[PDB]
Design an enzyme around this catalytic site. Structure first.
Site, PDB file in Angstrom:
ATOM      1  N   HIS A 257     -13.524 -47.292  53.085  1.00  0.00           N
ATOM      2  CA  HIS A 257     -12.769 -48.487  52.730  1.00  0.00           C
ATOM      3  C   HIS A 257     -13.581 -49.420  51.848  1.00  0.00           C
ATOM      4  O   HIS A 257     -13.029 -50.332  51.240  1.00  0.00           O
ATOM      5  CB  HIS A 257     -12.342 -49.232  53.992  1.00  0.00           C
ATOM      6  CG  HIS A 257     -13.491 -49.676  54.842  1.00  0.00           C
ATOM      7  ND1 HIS A 257     -14.200 -50.827  54.591  1.00  0.00           N
ATOM      8  CD2 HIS A 257     -14.076 -49.096  55.918  1.00  0.00           C
ATOM      9  CE1 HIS A 257     -15.180 -50.941  55.475  1.00  0.00           C
ATOM     10  NE2 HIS A 257     -15.123 -49.903  56.289  1.00  0.00           N
ATOM     11  N   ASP A 312     -15.973 -36.811  51.973  1.00  0.00           N
ATOM     12  CA  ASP A 312     -16.262 -35.973  53.129  1.00  0.00           C
ATOM     13  C   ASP A 312     -15.008 -35.381  53.776  1.00  0.00           C
ATOM     14  O   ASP A 312     -15.095 -34.397  54.506  1.00  0.00           O
ATOM     15  CB  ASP A 312     -17.052 -36.776  54.167  1.00  0.00           C
ATOM     16  CG  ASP A 312     -18.324 -37.374  53.590  1.00  0.00           C
ATOM     17  OD1 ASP A 312     -19.205 -36.592  53.171  1.00  0.00           O
ATOM     18  OD2 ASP A 312     -18.441 -38.621  53.547  1.00  0.00           O
TER      19      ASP A 312
END
Lengths: 376, 376
Positions: A257, A312
């Site tokens: 984020h 990821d």
């Protein structure tokens, strides 16, 4: 206390290398959109771009490939040590060890006339070491990369002992480009600290690897992919997400984020790579479709104005699709990011050098009188 | 853009460990003057002081010695690799490699119930590694340190294969105390950066060692001592000083300091150690007397600019008197400073932890459209 927590605001150096526009979600190496580099260039051209500063013409590109192709062999002590290690050793532990031996034996001097060529040589040898760390942990015999039509092909061929498909080669080449550089995390930081003392280039990578070995830096692709394995099936995604995340408390992996406002552009490309393998392999599709559903849930139940899958989230699926076991995922990051490490420390040493030595703030006891032990 | 280069004004952590007063030349470890610790205590007592926070009572001190004496063994991979490397390898190269192997094989978890005891074990194995690095470079056989009345004795006996004299034991014990901690140089910084990702303790030392291996941080004891070797005899000292330092405006190695504006309290103690060895050994006396004369000329020249002997001026003559070749001097610093490295990362991880991620300022190329290779 006036401590710079996490060195968060601290500009440790300038760079001409990499630029993140978090608002528009665009990543550039040396001004070039990473989408173009992946689509139309290659790891070798990026190597030249990052180290020399421009995309290479044919002749310069051929010079890069020539250095790589004559630089795969490492000292025998590297290979013997790697294969004497217990087979369950952490792969980054083996890598930092390997690079200590490279340091001890090559022990290169810093010199403007040769730093760039040295870095390309190190990049070659990082492929050799990564490929054989896999082979060691699998209890196979060693296999040194051999000249071929690309770096990515030479690496994959040595790793798996057979000629990779063209789709595999392209995905690997993409991955090397994708993780080449981004922010200044602890590994890149450690490398810079080592370079500030003019520790040899190999040892600067040792330092980077030592920091990457930590689970708050390494290990991310592993933990995210392990979610999908646990979920087991796309049908299971919605329940899992309910009783683990929503009525749970410790949370999901593989979402960010902080850096980007909407979406990590690298994460977007890993997804497209994963998806492409999915429509060729049932097991890859199973994990891809699980991943997709978790993405929707995770962005919905957390807001899209907030979070996004980070690199990821889908990288492990690509790595899996290429044939790599989970215990190699962080190593495959290191294999790519070593270009950025190298480019950064060369930038620092040649253009911005300054010994690094921060402050500690003394608290704790005031002067006291020595006290003999019988009285303690 | 003269940003936070060097991080010199950055506070990277607080510490309860080490206090320095540069005006009066006073060094304290957890409140106790370095002179009292050297004169009246021991490295084992300092281990307990730095890690646990107080001077130990007899029971606690016996517990330290018990952990030490049971922890000298290392994986056989360590021996195998150390002894297989070229005999000319840099010792810190060899040490950083050894610690990579320990990290791979032990891979200890952080745990506040065991961190301190693990630190002591690591201190045990540092002696084993440093002893055998000497042995490997001299083509001698490996020898593991054995339990004895003290850590300094056990290290010295393994290294030279002979029972040390009491003066030798005392000088080595003093040395370990003297170099235990000071400021936050690049090695300590690199260890902190690794600990910030929770990289295992051994790899945090790996990182420190990689930074230490650079000639702008490591190598100071060696360079200072080599002055005296070059001078050759006390009769030659004045000629050399005028030529190299006054006329050649070269730096006098072993003089000067960022915080001390008077004599380094550590240099005083090393000197007295050197002095004692000198009256029983003619080779030591040769270099001592040279060093004395240089110290006098040095003070006369630089004292008025608050430039004085620092800790590295006399340390090498001590290490020399102890039988160590010059190429071991920085390793002996590492052997001592590891206590400080370990104390600092335990403080960081247990009490101040924050992942480290500084920033880079982007200058360099504006966005630009991709350029096919034929147009380059």
């Amino acid at each position: 206390v006036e401590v710079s927590r996490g060195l968060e605001n601290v500009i440790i150096k300038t760079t001409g290398l990499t630029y993140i526009d978090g608002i528009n979600g665009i990543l550039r190496y040396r001004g070039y959109d990473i989408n173009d580099l992946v689509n139309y260039a290659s790891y070798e051209e990026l190597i030249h771009l990052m180290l020399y500063g421009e995309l290479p013409n044919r002749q310069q590109l051929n010079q890069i490939k020539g250095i790589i192709n004559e630089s795969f062999e490492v000292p025998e002590q590297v290979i013997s040590t790697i294969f004497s290690m217990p087979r369950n050793c952490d792969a980054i532990g083996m890598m930092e060890t390997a690079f200590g031996i490279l340091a001890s034996i090559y022990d290169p001097k810093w010199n403007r006339a040769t730093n760039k060529e040295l870095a390309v040589q190190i990049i070659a040898k990082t492929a050799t070491i990564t490929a054989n760390i896999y082979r060691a942990k699998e209890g196979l015999k060693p296999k040194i990369p051999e000249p071929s039509e690309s770096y990515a092909e030479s690496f994959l061929a040595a790793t798996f002992g057979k000629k990779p498909t063209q789709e595999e080669i392209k995905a690997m080449d993409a991955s090397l480009i994708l993780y080449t550089d981004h922010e200044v995390p602890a590994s890149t930081t450690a490398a810079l600290v080592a370079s500030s003392t003019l520790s040899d280039m190999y040892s600067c990578i040792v330092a980077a690897l030592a920091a990457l070995k930590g689970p708050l830096h390494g290990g991310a692709a592993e933990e995210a992919f392990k979610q999908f394995v646990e979920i087991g099936s796309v049908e299971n995604a919605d329940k899992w997400f309910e009783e683990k995340i929503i009525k749970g408390k410790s949370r999901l992996m593989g979402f960010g984020h902080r850096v980007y406002k909407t979406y990590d552009p690298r994460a977007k490309i890993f997804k497209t790579l994963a998806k492409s393998f999915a429509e060729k392999n049932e097991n890859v599709k199973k994990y891809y479709e699980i991943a997709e559903r978790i993405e929707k849930l995770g962005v919905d139940t957390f807001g899209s104005k907030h979070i996004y899958p980070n690199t990821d989230f889908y990288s492990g699926i690509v790595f899996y699709a290429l044939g790599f076991p989970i215990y190699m995922f962080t190593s495959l990051f290191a294999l790519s990011r070593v270009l950025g490490w190298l480019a950064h420390i060369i930038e620092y040493v040649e253009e911005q050098h300054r010994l690094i030595r921060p402050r500690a703030l003394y608290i704790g006891p005031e002067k006291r009188e020595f006290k003999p032990i019988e009285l303690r």
